[PDB]
Amino acid sequence: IEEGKLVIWINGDKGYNGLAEVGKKFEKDTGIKVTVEHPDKLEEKFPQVAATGDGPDIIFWAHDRFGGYAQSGLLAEITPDKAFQDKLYPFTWDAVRYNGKLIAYPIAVEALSLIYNKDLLPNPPKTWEEIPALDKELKAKGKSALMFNLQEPYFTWPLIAADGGYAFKYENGKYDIKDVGVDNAGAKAGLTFLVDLIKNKHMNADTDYSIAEAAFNKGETAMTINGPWAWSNIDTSKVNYGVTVLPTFKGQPSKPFVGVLSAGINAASPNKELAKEFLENYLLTDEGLEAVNKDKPLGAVALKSYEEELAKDPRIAATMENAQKGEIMPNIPQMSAFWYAVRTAVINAASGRQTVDEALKDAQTNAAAHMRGFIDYIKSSNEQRINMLSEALEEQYSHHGNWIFLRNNDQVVYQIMRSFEQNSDSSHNLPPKGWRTQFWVVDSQFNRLVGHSGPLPKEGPRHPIRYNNEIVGWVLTTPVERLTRNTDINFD
C-alpha cells in the first residue's frame, strides 16, 4: 500500500462520482492524490486483500457479515476528538463501536419507518393495539389495514423486542452471550401479538416483500413497513403517501435495527493520518455529504449540520426519528446463526405449527447450544496452537541447548511456528489477529526473551517449555477472551 496518497473503495451502487469530487478538493488543498474505485463483489474483495496488507486506505460498507471486518482486525481505531464527536448524533457512534472503541465514521443512517396511505387513512395509528379495530373498519371498503414482509426477522423483530426482547445483553461494551433474551417475558409478548393478527384473519402468514409492496402501491392496504430504498418504487405509482414513527406496543416503542454506512481506515495503511484529515475535514462536512448525496442519495446522515437540512423532507426526519429509538445490531461473531434460529421460530408460530411459547423456547435452546459449541471450538483450537508453539520452540531449543537462537522479535517466532508445521506435516493453524497483545516467551527464571518491554501479567496462561525432563521456559500466551475476533464478547 502506497505512501503519500489516498485510495478509496466504495460500492458502485453508491455516489462514487460525488465522492471523487470531495477527493478533487482534497487534491487542490493538499497536493495528495485521491483515487476512488468501485470494485465488484466488494464485500468479498476487501477482506481478501486487506488481510495481507494491500488494498485501500479507506473502505465503505453497509454490510460486512455483522461485524466481520472488525472481528478480523481489518480496521484501525479512529480517533476523533471530543469536539468532532458532537458534530454527529451520539447514538450513531454506538453503531460503529467494537470492544468499546470506535472503528469507523458514521456517514449515513437507515431504519424502517411506517409508510401509510394518506387517502385511505389520514391519521395513522400511533399504537399496535389499535390496528385490529382499524383492519375491520377498512376490510369493508375492500382494503386491508397493514401488509409487510413477515418472513424476515429484519421486519418482525422490532415488535418482538418492543416490550423487551433482545439478542444478547450489551452490558459493558461487550455482549454477554450467556444471557439470551429471546424467550423473554417481553419477547413472548411481542411475538404472540403478531401471530394473533394472523389468527384473527387480519394479516396473512405468507405475505413477503413483493406481495406486501405490490399491494400497497395499488391502494389495497392502508399501511406498510419499509425503509428509504422502497420509496422510489412507491413514487412512480402516484400514491399520496406519508412516512411516520413506528407504532408502540405495551407502551414501549418499536425498536428497528439501526443500519449504518461506515467509512473505516484500513488497519494496514501507512496513511491513517492523511485519511483522518480527509474524512473529518472534507467528507464529513455539509459540502462533502452534499456532493455525494446529489450523485446517489444517502438517506439520513449522522452529521447534525447536514441532517437538519435533509430533514426538511419529513420522510427523512421520520427515518432518523425511528433510528434514534432503534437498537444497535450486535457485531459479535456467529450472529448469522442466531438470526436463522429466530427466522424459523417466527415462521413456525405464524404457520400455527408451534405455540409461541414453544417456538421461542426452541429458538432459545438452539442459540445457547450453538453459542456453547462456539466457545468449545475457539477454546480447543487455541490450545492446539499453544501446544504446537511449545513443540516448535522445544525443537529449536534442542539445537544448541539454550536461548541464543531466539531474538526478541514477535514475527520470528511466528515463522518458527510456520516452519514447524510445514516440516511436521501438521494441519495449517497459526496465531490469529491480536495474538501478540499479551504474548511473551520467558525462560526458567522468567527473564523476558520475546515480548513488549513493560510489566508482565502476574497470572494468565503459561504453557511450559520442557526439554530434558526440566522446564526451560514458558510461553505466556494470549487469553482467548481477548483475541481480536472475540473481544466483543463476555463469557460469564
Task: Output the DSSP codes for 257-270.
Answer: EEEEEEEEEBTT-T
Which region holds residue 291: left if phi is over 0, alpha if psi is between -120 and 50, else beta?
A: alpha
Instruction: Give domain 5-110+258-310's CATH architecture.
Output: 3-Layer(aba) Sandwich (3.40)
- Half-sphere exposure of 236 toward its Cβ, with a 13 Å CA cutoff? 4
Q: Any bridge partners for residue 311, and if so which?
A: none
Is residue 61 within a helix (H) or strand (E), and if so which, with residue range? Answer: strand 58-61
Which residues precede a break in the chain, with C-to-N distance above 2.5 Å? none
Biggest distance spanned by C-alpha atoms of the chain: 92
Q: How far apart are CA 274 and CA 323, in angstroms?
A: 31
CB of 6 closer than 8 Å to CB of 33: yes
Q: In the PDB record, what is the listed experimental method? A: X-ray
Sign of the Cα torsion 289, 290, 296, 300 reads positive
Residue 298 and residue 261 in contact, taking contact as beta carbons nearer than 8 Å: yes
Indicate the residue type of 440.
W
- The verdict on domain 113-255+332-354 having CATH code 3.40.50.300 is no
Angle of the 153-162 helix axis to the 185-199 helix axis, nearest 10: 120
CA 235 to chain centre: 31
User: Of 177, 161, 224, which is closest to residue 489 (Cα–Cα)?
Assistant: 177
- Between 356-397 and 410-424, two packed helices, what is the crossing angle to 10 degrees? 90
Question: 448 and 476 in contact (C-beta within 8 Å)?
Answer: no
For residue 161, the cross-strand partners are none
Name beta bridge partners: 476.
Answer: 440, 462
How far is residue 139's CA from residue 133's CA, in Å, rounded to a whole number? 10
CB 284 within 8 A of CB 23: no
Answer for the pair 256, 158: CB distance below 8 angstroms, yes or no: yes
110, 329 Cβ separation under 8 angstroms: no
How far is Cα 410 from Cα 161, in angstroms, rounded to an integer?
Answer: 46
C-alpha span between 216 and 212 (Å, rounded) = 6
Indicate the length of the chain as a whole number. 492
Instruction: Evaluate whether 150 touches 203 at the Cβ level (below 8 Å).
Output: yes
Whole-angstrom distance, CA of residue 273 vs CA of residue 264: 12
How far apart CA 427 and CA 352 sit, in angstroms, is: 48
Cell of 112: 424502517
In the block, cell 424459523 appears at 344
- DSSP label at residue 88: B
Instruction: Give yes or no for a contact between 356 and 396, defined as CB atoms under 8 angstroms apart.
Output: no
477 phi/psi in degrees, rounded to 5 = -90, -175
Q: Are 181 and 166 in contact (CB under 8 A)?
A: yes
Between CA 10 and CA 57 the distance in angstroms is: 11
Sign of CA dihedral 334, 94, 275, 6: positive
Question: Is 222 in contact with 145 (CB distance < 8 Å)?
Answer: yes
Half-sphere exposure of 375 (CA within 13 A, CB side): 13
Structural contact between residues 143 and 220, judged by C-beta atoms closer than 8 angstroms: yes
CA-to-CA distance for 267 and 69, rounded, in angstroms?
A: 10
What are the distances in angstroms from CA 4 to CA 24, 33, 220?
15, 8, 58
* Residue (of 178, 196, 151) closest to 342 by Cα position: 151
3 state DSSP class of 457:
coil
Bridge partners (DSSP) listed for residue 466:
471
C-alpha cell at 169: 445483553
- Residue 434 in contact with residue 482, Cβ under 8 Å? yes
Evaluate whether 248 touches 242 at the Cβ level (below 8 Å).
no
- What single letter denotes the amino acid at residue 483? L
Beta bridge partners, 465, equal: 473
CA distance 262 to 106: 5
Q: In the chain, which segments carry CATH 3.40.190.10?
A: 5-110+258-310, 113-255+332-354
Complete DSSP assignment for 242-262:
EEEPPPBBTTBPP--EEEEEE
Which distant-in-sequence residues (6+ apart) come within 8 Å of 365 by Cβ? none
- Burial string for 227-265 (b: 16+ CB within 10 Å, else e) reads bbebbeebeeeebebbbbbbbbbeeebbbbbbbbbbbbb
Helix (H, G, I), strand (E, B) or coil at 227: coil
Q: Closest Cα to residue 390, out of 366, 370, 361, 420?
A: 420
The residues, ordered by sequence, that sit 6+ positions from 265 with a Cβ below 8 Å of its Cβ are: 57, 58, 75, 76, 78, 272, 275, 276, 279
Beta strands 175-180 and 489-490 are parallel
- Output phi, psi for 42, to 5 deg: -70, -45
Long-range contacts, stretch 428-434, CB < 8 angstroms, 24+ apart:
429/381, 429/384, 429/385, 429/388, 430/385, 431/385, 431/389, 432/483, 432/484, 432/485, 433/72, 433/73, 433/483, 433/484, 433/485, 434/73, 434/478, 434/482, 434/483, 434/484, 434/485, 434/487
Cell of 417: 511456528
- Cα separations (Å) of 249 from 125, 126, 187, 371? 12, 9, 12, 30
Give me the phi and psi of 453, to 5 degrees please.
Answer: -95, 0
Of the candidates 145, 149, 134, 148, the one whose C-alpha atom is nearest the C-alpha of residue 221 is: 145
**CA quadruple 339, 345, 350, 351: dihedral, nearest 10:** 120
Among 389, 392, 483, 473, smallest CA distance to 436 is for 483
**Cα–Cα distance for residue pair 260/84, rounded to 1 Å:** 18
What is the number of H-type helices and E-type strands within the chain? 17, 20
Angle at 427 between CA 425 and CA 429, to 5 degrees: 125
